[PDB]
Amino acid sequence: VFHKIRNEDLIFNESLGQGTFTKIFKGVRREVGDYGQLHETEVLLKVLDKAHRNYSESFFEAASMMSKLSHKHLVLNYGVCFCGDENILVQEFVKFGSLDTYLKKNKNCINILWKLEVAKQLAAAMHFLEENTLIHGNVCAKNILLIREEDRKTGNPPFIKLSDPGISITVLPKDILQERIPWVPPECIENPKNLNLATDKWSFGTTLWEICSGGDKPLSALDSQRKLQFYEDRHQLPAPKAAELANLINNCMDYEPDHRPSFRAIIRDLNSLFT
Numbered sequence: 001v002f003h004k005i006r007n008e009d010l011i012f013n014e015s016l017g018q019g020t021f022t023k024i025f026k027g028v029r030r031e032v033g034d035y036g037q038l039h040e041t042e043v044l045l046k047v048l049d050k051a052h053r054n055y056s057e058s059f060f061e062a063a064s065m066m067s068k069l070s071h072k073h074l075v076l077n078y079g080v081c082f083c084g085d086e087n088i089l090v091q092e093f094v095k096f097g098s099l100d101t102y103l104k105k106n107k108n109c110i111n112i113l114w115k116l117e118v119a120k121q122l123a124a125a126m127h128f129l130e131e132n133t134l135i136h137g138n139v140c141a142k143n144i145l146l147i148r149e150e151d152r153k154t155g156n157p158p159f160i161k162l163s164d165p166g167i168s169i170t171v172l173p174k175d176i177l178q179e180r181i182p183w184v185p186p187e188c189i190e191n192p193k194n195l196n197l198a199t200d201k202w203s204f205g206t207t208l209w210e211i212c213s214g215g216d217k218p219l220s221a222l223d224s225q226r227k228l229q230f231y232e233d234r235h236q237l238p239a240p241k242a243a244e245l246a247n248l249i250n251n252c253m254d255y256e257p258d259h260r261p262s263f264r265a266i267i268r269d270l271n272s273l274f275t
């Protein structure tokens with residue numbers, strides 16, 4: 001059960017765009033913080049129409065269950081505003097935003113070791129979720145949030161978090177799942193009830209492809225029908241431009257869900273690259 005935030009303490013400043021049946025804003029939350037200090041905290045606001053009751057309930061149940069598992073690589077949600085005809089998730093505002101946009105804005109002038117570090121951090125988050133048997137179901141590079149850039153002087157690496165899960169693919173329209181190929185795995189295209197921890201291993205592979213491809217979207221040239229044929233003919237993605245993780249990508253994007261490796265195994269594989 002999330003902390004309730006009053007509409008009166010939320011200021012909406014910028015309209016940023018949309019997610020899946022959500023509207024996204026930058027704003028400020030007025031709050032009493034540590035030592036009783038009054039703060040105006042920057043927040044990322046995700047707004048759902050309460051008339052889409054099934055979507056809203058799925059969205060907030062997913063955010064709540066994940067926010068019960070505090071972890072350094074899982075986004076902080078401050079709470080929720082049951083805000084009239086809308087329900088609003090109040091999330092921390094991450095300074096550098098989504099990783100796919102970041103990589104594009106930096107023109108993929110990012111070395112493989114940076115990419116490896118981000119993959120290790122995501123894998124650490126996913127291992128924690130796996131140990132907690134919590135399915136995320138929407139792993140993608142847009143949901144990797146960059147808290148801090150690398151600092152070459154100190155040797156500090158970039159630092160990421162994984163965003164909230166959003167509406168479950170067990171509730172979303174089939175057309176949305178197909179648009180989300182190749183993040184949504186083939187078994188969930190066949191039947192969304194096949195959602196399983198194995199789903200996240202597949203999507204982790206697709207996410208690593210995105211990271212290695214500078215924020216390109218795999219299969220962007222394919223409409224939904226060509227994306228179905230992609231899975232029918234059992235194709236794999238092409239090796240990304242930075243090919244060091246291509247084997248891992250393909251091992252995670254296994255058409256047999258039960259064969260996808262555990263996140264402990266994935267981490268050991270990541271740790272073994274470059275001796």
Ligand SMILES: Cc1ccc(Nc2nc(N)nc(CN(C)Cc3ccc(Br)s3)n2)cc1
Nearest residue numbers: 016017024044092093094095096097098142
């Ligand atoms: C330009 C800029 C810079 C930083 C941030 N900060 C941020 N903080 C959080 N917590 N999450 C996100 C990304 N998630 C996927 C929500 C969004 C979906 C669509 C958009 Br557009 S933002 N961005 C946002 C915009």
